[PDB]
Amino acid sequence: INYNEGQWSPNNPSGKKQYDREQLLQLREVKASRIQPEVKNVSILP
């Protein structure tokens, strides 16, 4: 995705770990975001 100057990115590991709403939502569809997580309670699962 697009990154701002000074922002953390794979190309800029020293950048600030601050992300905008739009940037965060763009990462919602990557493969790592689609893996099922490990959770203790089940009632909140669809």
Partner 1 sequence: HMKHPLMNVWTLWYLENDREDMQNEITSFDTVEDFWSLYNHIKPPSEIKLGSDYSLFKKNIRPMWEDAANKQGGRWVITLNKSSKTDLDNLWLDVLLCLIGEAFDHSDQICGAVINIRGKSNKISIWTADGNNEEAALEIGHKLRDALRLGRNNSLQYQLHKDVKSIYTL
What is the contact surface with partner 1 in residues (CB under 8 A)?
8-10, 16-21, 23-25, 27-28, 30, 32-41, 43-46
Render 35-46 in DSSP notation, one character per residue. SPPP-S--TT--
| Smallest separation, CB 23 to partner 1 (Å) | 8
- Does residue 11 contact residue 20 with C-beta atoms inside 8 Å? no
Q: How far is 46 from 34, CA to CA, in rounded Å?
A: 15
Closer to partner 1 by Cβ: residue 5 or 39: 39
Closer to partner 1 by Cβ: residue 5 or 35: 35
